[PDB]
Every structure is written in structure tokens, then in C-alpha cells.
């Protein structure tokens, strides 16, 4: 009903002839972080989390850090008349969460706010508090845990709609995981494969994930020479296969 173990998804059935509908739970994750909500008050509490080391700790650290950032970005706005729509977007690769507000009257008219939780293109190491480095490190670890949760659920729960589902919506998380670990304290080939091939089908992934190949040395060195991202002055990602995909905005809603 409400409660589910962290990172797991549900597959529901729309009918129009039936098509699957993936409930990835990304919207809900983000929403909680924005509200500063604590682990114990989430749909995620009360499962065993030995598979996800430090989930509750890092989640609460991250929850605070996101909450405070939100407040800083919204203290300079008057939002007493307005309501946050149940729509969150993510722009990449800074993991820029974007909210839209509208007046309680309508539901001056609409207002927008963006916070880059994991800024990657333009950073200061030396001129950054411990609070910020600790908050970011916690956000990234939470994202990694979410993905591990996703993968473990996928591995244990075959479904006949798998062949029609892909890791598409997880891309911004994956890109930020890889980007942050690289550009701040190596590249995890699993994360990099999934970020590169956002069209990876679920059944194929399950069968293949454990035999995934490492980053080719020509790519590793092209990365050290030129970044991971290619700015067009719109950002392009430097894939594990040398592809150069455009990282478009993703939109998440409450299920």
C-alpha cells in the first residue's frame, strides 16, 4: 500500500490493450528530501537495511542539507499565497531539482525555483564548508543506495513487462553519481554503463549486469584529457562507449 523498501519500484497496469506503468519512486524520494523529512517518517522505514549500509544516517544528513538549501533559495521569495505543484524536474549534470509554485487561488501566477544539489560544472574544494561537503557526500551516497535498492529489487523480481521497461528515468541520478565521484572525492563501471545506456531494458539488465565490462582505456584517457561533460555554449555526456548523448531534463510526478 504505502510502505516499500528503499529504491524498489512497482509495475502497475494502464489500459487503453494493456501497457505497463513503472512507479520508480524517484518523485517521492526527492519530495522527502525537500521537506527535510526524516527517515523514520518515510514510506521506507522498518525494513532490514543491512544491504544498504548507513541508509538512515546519510538519509537524514542529506535530508537536512537539501531542506536548508531549499529554504535559502526560497527565503528570498514570498510563497505564502502559493502551493508547490506535485511536479519535480531534474536538470543534469548538477542534479538541479526544479519546483513550480502556483497560487492557492488558481489551483505572480506561477513561480519557479532551482537548487543544484550536486553542482559539477562550476565549483569553488578550498572555499567550501564542511557542512556542504558533508551534505553533498550524503546526498550522493543516498543516490547510490537508491540505485542499489533498485537493482536488488530488479534482480529478485522478474515480471513479464520487464522487456518493455528501461532505466531511462534513473539517468540524472546515475550521471550525478558518476560525475561527483569522478570530479571530487575513479569510475564505477556499473553506474557508468547505466548512465550511458539509458535504454537498458530490465530483463536484459538482470541477465547481463553481473558480467558488465570495464571502461575501455581509450575512454578512460579521453576522460582525463577532456572531462566527462562537453559543454555546448546544453551539455553532452561522454559515454563509456564513446557516445555523446544529450542529457535532457526529466520530469517526475507523484504516483
Amino acid at each position: 500500500l504505502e510502505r516499500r523498501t528503499f529504491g524498489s519500484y512497482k509495475i502497475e497496469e494502464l489500459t487503453i490493450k494493456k501497457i505497463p506503468l513503472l512507479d520508480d519512486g524517484i518523485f517521492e524520494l526527492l519530495n522527502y528530501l525537500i521537506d527535510g523529512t526524516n527517515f523514520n517518517k518515510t514510506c521506507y522505514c522498518g525494513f532490514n537495511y543491512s544491504h544498504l549500509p548507513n541508509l538512515e544516517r546519510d538519509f537524514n544528513i542529506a535530508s537536512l542539507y537539501v531542506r536548508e538549501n531549499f529554504e535559502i533559495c526560497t527565503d528570498q521569495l514570498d510563497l505564502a499565497n502559493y502551493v508547490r505543484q506535485p511536479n519535480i524536474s531534474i536538470k543534469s549534470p548538477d542534479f538541479t531539482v526544479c519546483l513550480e509554485y502556483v497560487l492557492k487561488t488558481v489551483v505572480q501566477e506561477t513561480k519557479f525555483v532551482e537548487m543544484s544539489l550536486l553542482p559539477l560544472l562550476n565549483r569553488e574544494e578550498e572555499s567550501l564548508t564542511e557542512e556542504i561537503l558533508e551534505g553533498e557526500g550524503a546526498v550522493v551516497n543516498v543516490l547510490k543506495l537508491f540505485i542499489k535498492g533498485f537493482l536488488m529489487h530488479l534482480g529478485e523480481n522478474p515480471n513479464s513487462y520487464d522487456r518493455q521497461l528501461t532505466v531511462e528515468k534513473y539517468r540524472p541520478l546515475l550521471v550525478s553519481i558518476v560525475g561527483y565521484e569522478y570530479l571530487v572525492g575513479k569510475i564505477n563501471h556499473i553506474y557508468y554503463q547505466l548512465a550511458t545506456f539509458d535504454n537498458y531494458p530490465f530483463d536484459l539488465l538482470r541477465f547481463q549486469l553481473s558480467s558488465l565490462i570495464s571502461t575501455p582505456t581509450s575512454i578512460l584517457e579521453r576522460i582525463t584529457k577532456e572531462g566527462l561533460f562537453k559543454i555546448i555554449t546544453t551539455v553532452l555526456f561522454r559515454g563509456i562507449n564513446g557516445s555523446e548523448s544529450f542529457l535532457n531534463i526529466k520530469r517526475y510526478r507523484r504516483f
Binding site: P53, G155, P158, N188, Y191, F207, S210
Partner: peptide, 16 residues
């Protein structure tokens, strides 16, 4: 999908 092989990914090298 009742026949599909399951996999345990709990030990994948995911830097957590």
C-alpha cells in the same frame, strides 16, 4: 515470468 532466473545483486561493487 515465473520461470525467469533470479539474481542476487547485493554483492555488486557499488561503492557503498
Amino acid at each position: 515470468a515465473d520461470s525467469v532466473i533470479k539474481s542476487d545483486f547485493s554483492s555488486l561493487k557499488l561503492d557503498v
